[PDB]
Recover the amino acids of this structure.
């Protein structure tokens, strides 16, 4: 069987010959009970770069050992791409949200042999699920693999926006000191109201990390948390996003991209936020209206915006989130720390092993069971 | 009387004409139950810029109402400085650590009428206490006023170093995407070993904030915490700094600058840290050897360094911490967020009220009772 695997380019300096550190911590479980991925073996050392083309998610020796072929490419856009040229033949397709090979209805129809689509990461919005179901295709993602990584990025970005980190760092680089320049927009996070859209794996991890900062916590989720959890964290549940954002100094978005979240943060909802609110979005780019964010930063309605997720990806050179005032953006990286890569790579293998050995794929990994 | 108050320059764009936020959270007390400052009145809105020359720590109306004179400058360096000029006559000297008017033994000899030296902030290492004790000069600082502010800065810097935030932001500004270049040095903090030098007001606030990141916590303090506290936070006590840093992925320094700590992180101590350790220092610059830090970052012994404190202050344009690799520096800003300034400015006025009304200055503010 042919496995077709789309990954991002190596670093422009070459695939790394060494790393800043010798190893990474062992993670073998997640809050709430779920175990870390359980492949029978891994053919990499946690901490290696796995998610770029030379890394191959550590899959080659395993797949070739079983008589399969593995095609790895970053070339994923259009009919002429290696991806589309190889797609009709592939039984299995794998990519990461950070560099996603879209399975549109058109691509799915062309993909005559496709039985399994794996998301190495979380969030399968790049796969047409209606089309997968129609064609009996199984769709899996590595649930929880990077949720914590994101939660860390979120808290980092909230503190960086509120405290005015990056502007202050720039004064250092520019050879200045300029205390008042740095702190005329520098606040403490303490005792601010912070709210999350969603309290799933990421959102709950964010709340737990925010708690000791002594903020007042708020959230909305279609699935309300147990009352006892609300009480332990000091959470206020709100019946809607709109109702929540009205009282928040800071809002972080941690819901998947789907009908109810597409363009959720448009001019109208942003206008309901407190003037000078901070908005953080490591969920998906399209949950926030591109130009509405820009307008709100320009007017001061938002004091700052930060996230790692864009529409489209990669963001073109002219993408206006690059030059809008008061941002702390990164490219789409939070879910692809080297730490996270070890887990979703192990998880991708665990899924492939279940597939080939005809064992059930873990229930929490399954998005459609074909 | 004459009050001589050294503050930092206004922003280059002048005293702020507006702010990003309408207000700041009300903070009436600190963890453990010390009250927030208790002046009879304040003449500012919390959230206003107070620590620059036009801000005046909001003291003018009050001091002039009592018939006193208030002289505010940023000109603090040498014998031909406004500070030194004005010093012979001043009954009270006020300055902040962010832009410190150093009270050396010569300047104190010169300071014929000086009876009260107030640190608007925390940490009086710019004041020679023995020369001050000699002259029955009172030395006071606004204990706890910005402790929490620093702790937030620390967690922000730890996350930014470990996850590789600033170089990733720069790819955004430069028009790139470059996922692998971002993440080839990007780790999660989760389950790393983190140690603090000191668990006082800052150190303990750091530990509490790091706890739900699910790191393994370590500390040294000259005064060991209660067992119940170490148990609750899961802390490993070490009998020295050297003993702790050998097992830490991240070290944060939160001790005052004194003989115990001057030049503590030298070539030797740093050589005992893990290869690729991260070091954060928002305490005082001199606690780390300037050139040692540079060498360690150049060799990769440290994967990163971040902090807001320097020697001297301001740092010259050629100070090597500006250009050394893998840093996340700011100028000395963490204890002077707008939120902190509201508290230390209030505390400054509280102190002055006590002095003028011949009431005792709260004991927790007193460094020397003269
Ligand atoms: N690198 C990255 O930036 C990165 C990595 C992983 C995940 N993500 C994104 O974050 C999303 C969340 O991941 P997770 O691990 O928390 O998933 P999860 O499934 O554990 O949690 C998602 C939560 O969103 C809630 N939800 C759905 N629609 C909502 C709405 N309209 N309002 C409020 N809550 C709503 C669900 O009830 C659920 O609790 C993923 O779908 C993905 O899009 C980003
Ligand atoms: N803007 C800033 O970056 C900023 C702001 C305020 C404070 N500071 C610095 O932080 C220092 C600590 O502030 P704090 O509010 O926590 O004060 P604190 O007095 O509550 O805490 C100091 C702690 O350090 C401990 N200590 C002293 N010598 C030590 C040593 N050699 N090893 C380990 N622990 C040692 C003490 O026992 C105490 O627990 C201040 O003295 C100041 O230099 C920096």
């Amino acid at each position: 069987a042919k496995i077709l695997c789309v990954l991002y380019d190596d670093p422009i300096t070459g695939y790394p010959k060494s790393y800043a550190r010798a190893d990474v911590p062992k993670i073998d479980h997640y809050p709430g009970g779920q175990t870390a991925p359980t492949p029978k073996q891994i053919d990499f050392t946690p901490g290696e770069l796995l998610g770029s083309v030379s890394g191959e998610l550590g899959l080659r020796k395993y797949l070739e050992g079983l008589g399969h072929t593995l095609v790895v490419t970053s070339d994923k856009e259009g009919e002429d791409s290696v991806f589309e040229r190889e797609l009709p033949d592939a039984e299995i397709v794998i990519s990461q949200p950070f560099w996603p090979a879209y399975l549109t209805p058109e691509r799915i129809a062309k993909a005559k042999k496709l039985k399994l689509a794996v998301t190495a990461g979380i969030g399968s919005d790049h796969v047409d699920l209606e089309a997968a179901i129609k064609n009996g295709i199984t769709v899996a993602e590595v649930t929880y693999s990077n949720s914590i990584s994101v939660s860390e990025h979120v808290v980092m970005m909230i503190l960086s926006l509120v405290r005015n980190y990056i502007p202050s760092y720039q004064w250092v680089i520019k050879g200045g000191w300029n205390i008042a320049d740095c702190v005329e927009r520098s606040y403490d996070l303490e005792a601010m109201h912070v709210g999350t859209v969603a309290a799933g794996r990421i959102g709950l991890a964010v709340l737990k990390r925010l708690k000791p900062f002594d903020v007042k916590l708020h959230y909305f989720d279609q699935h309300r948390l147990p009352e006892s959890v609300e009480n332990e964290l000091g959470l206020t549940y709100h019946p809607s996003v709109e109702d929540m954002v009205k009282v928040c100094d800071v809002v972080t978005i941690n819901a998947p991209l789907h009908p109810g979240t597409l363009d959720l943060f448009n001019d109208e909802l942003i206008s309901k936020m407190k003037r000078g609110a901070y908005l953080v979005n490591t969920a998906r780019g399209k949950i926030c209206n591109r130009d509405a964010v820009v307008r709100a930063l320009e007017s001061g309605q938002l004091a700052g915006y930060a996230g790692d997720v864009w529409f489209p990806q990669p963001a073109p050179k002219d993408h206006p989130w690059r030059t809008m005032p008061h941002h702390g953006m990164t490219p789409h990286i939070s879910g692809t720390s080297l730490s996270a890569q070890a887990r979703y790579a192990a998880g991708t293998r665990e899924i492939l092993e279940c597939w080939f050995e005809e064992r059930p794929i873990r229930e929490e990994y399954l998005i459609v069971d074909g």
